[PDB]
A paper describes a structure:
HmuTUV forms an ABC-type heme transporter system, in which HmuT, HmuU, and HmuV are the heme binding lipoprotein, permease, and ATPase, respectively. CgHmuT consists of two lobes connected with a α-helix, both of which consist of a five-stranded β-sheet and four α-helices. His141 and Tyr240 are coordinated to the heme as the axial ligands and Arg242 forms a hydrogen bond with Tyr240 in CgHmuT. As CgHmuT is a substrate (heme) binding protein that shuttles heme to the cognate ABC-type heme transporter CgHmuUV in Corynebacteria, the regulation of heme binding and release is very important for its physiological function.
The purified heme-bound proteins were crystallized, and the crystal structures of H141A-, Y240A-, and R242A-CgHmuT were determined in the holo-form at the resolution of 1.30, 1.65, and 1.30 Å, respectively. While two different orientations of heme were observed in Y240A-CgHmuT, heme was accommodated with a single orientation in H140A- and R242A-CgHmuT. Ferric R242A-CgHmuT showed the ν2 bands at 1556 and 1581 cm−1 and the ν3 bands at 1476 and 1503 cm−1, which were identical to those of the wild type. The set of the ν2 and ν3 bands at 1556 and 1476 cm−1 are due to a high-spin heme, while those at 1581 and 1503 cm−1 are due to a low-spin heme. These results indicate that there is equilibrium between the high-spin and low-spin species in the R242A-CgHmuT solution, as is the case of the wild type. While the heme bound to wild-type CgHmuT is not reduced by dithionite under normal conditions, the heme in H141A-, Y240A-, and R242A-CgHmuT are reduced by dithionite. The change in the redox property of R242A-CgHmuTA will be caused by a similar effect upon a loss of hydrogen bond between Tyr240 and Arg242.
Numbering used by the authors: 32 to 355
The structure:
């Protein structure tokens, strides 16, 4: 097991303690680059496919890839398959160390910039509608860039299938199968450990998204996949209990209604609202159980909702902070 040392450490450390008595910030450090399944990936090209929007695409050259999304998944999967050196641009969400010097093709957060994309002379764009504008995606295709729209399932159960889908696009089915199986083994193993750590009465959680000290401050719902993360950590997602399907402003009324025990956040996002002290100034935060315990689990932004290959490790690291 790639997470074997971590699992052994967790099993040796005590969890008789009541996690409802823990206070303060817990921050999970960056997990780093995905370990590739091969050092000699040899894409079997060309590939013909029909993408998630119904577009027929031929992928004939994967030398210059733009793997773009909101969550940071595709760039990590591409590296896991053996093609990290082929990535020529990224969004702000693909924060993994291997891409730190790679050109960023989004502006103002997540807005696709056509000029930045086309100036990189990509041979393949892998993207989904988690980012836009849609019109920019259309412009890139119209400029002659092979563009493949994905629609990943983004559940823990589908980590392997989402990997296999990416692998098919780039003509690496064997690497896809290896990476899928490794990643699913790691998540199931993590879950066995999480189940041993969790309290009988699960912790109530919400995923709080922040960008700055103003109104970009949301409870994330079904569409963003945080339920999958929260339940993977042994929690109950209060957004799911309330039926939030997209996102909702994290105003005083919503926070009082949801009343989580833990806020799950992204670490750079938390910094952007002034850290835990800045968070505690926001209306309604301090009045929740989580606020009263200053209880925040901050996860590396570009891994937090990426799922993919490193999900198991994320769950183990995060659960250690919740329960040990
Ligand atoms: C759910 C997954 C998401 C992830 C992983 C993510 C990640 C990030 C990251 C890593 C940054 C970079 C901060 C920086 O510029 O230094 C950022 C910025 C930003 N995000 Fe997101 N984001 C997500 C969702 C959203 C959503 C739903 C919105 C708005 C509805 C949003 C709006 C912004 C804005 C406005 C910025 C710019 C902040 C700045 O100038 O620094 N993001 N995001």
């Amino acid at each position: 097991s790639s997470n074997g040392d971590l699992i052994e450490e967790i099993q040796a450390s005590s969890t008789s303690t009541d996690p409802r008595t823990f206070t303060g910030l817990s921050i999970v450090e960056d997990i780093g680059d995905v370990v590739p399944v091969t050092d000699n990936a040899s894409p079997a090209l060309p590939v013909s496919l029909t993408d998630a929007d119904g577009n027929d695409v031929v992928v004939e050259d994967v030398s210059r890839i733009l793997p773009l999304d909101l969550y940071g998944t595709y760039s990590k999967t591409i590296a896991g398959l053996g093609l990290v050196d082929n990535i020529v641009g990224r969004t702000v969400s693909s924060t993994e160390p291997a891409l730190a010097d790679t050109e960023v093709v989004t502006t103002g957060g997540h807005t696709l910039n056509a000029e930045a994309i086309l100036n990189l002379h990509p041979t393949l764009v892998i993207i989904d509608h988690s980012i836009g504008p849609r019109e920019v995606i259309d412009q890139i295709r119209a400029a002659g860039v092979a563009t493949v729209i994905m629609s990943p399932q983004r559940s823990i159960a589908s980590i392997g299938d989402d990997i296999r889908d990416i692998a098919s696009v780039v003509g690496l089915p064997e690497e896809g199968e290896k990476l899928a199986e490794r990643s699913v083994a790691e998540v199931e193993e993590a879950s066995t450990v999480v189940d041993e750590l969790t309290p009988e009465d699960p912790l109530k959680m919400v995923f709080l998204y922040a960008a700055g000290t103003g109104g970009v401050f949301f409870i994330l719902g079904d569409a963003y996949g945080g339920r999958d993360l929260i339940e993977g950590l042994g929690g109950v997602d209060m957004a799911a209990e309330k039926g939030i399907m997209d996102l909702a402003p994290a105003n005083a009324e919503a926070l009082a209604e949801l009343n989580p025990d833990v806020f799950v956040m992204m670490s750079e996002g938390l910094v952007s609202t002034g850290g835990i002290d800045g968070l505690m100034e926001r209306p309604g935060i301090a009045q929740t159980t989580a606020g009263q315990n200053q209880r925040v689990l901050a996860l590396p932004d570009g891994q937090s909702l990426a799922f993919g290959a490193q999900t198991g490790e994320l769950l183990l690291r995060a659960s250690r902070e919740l329960y040990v």
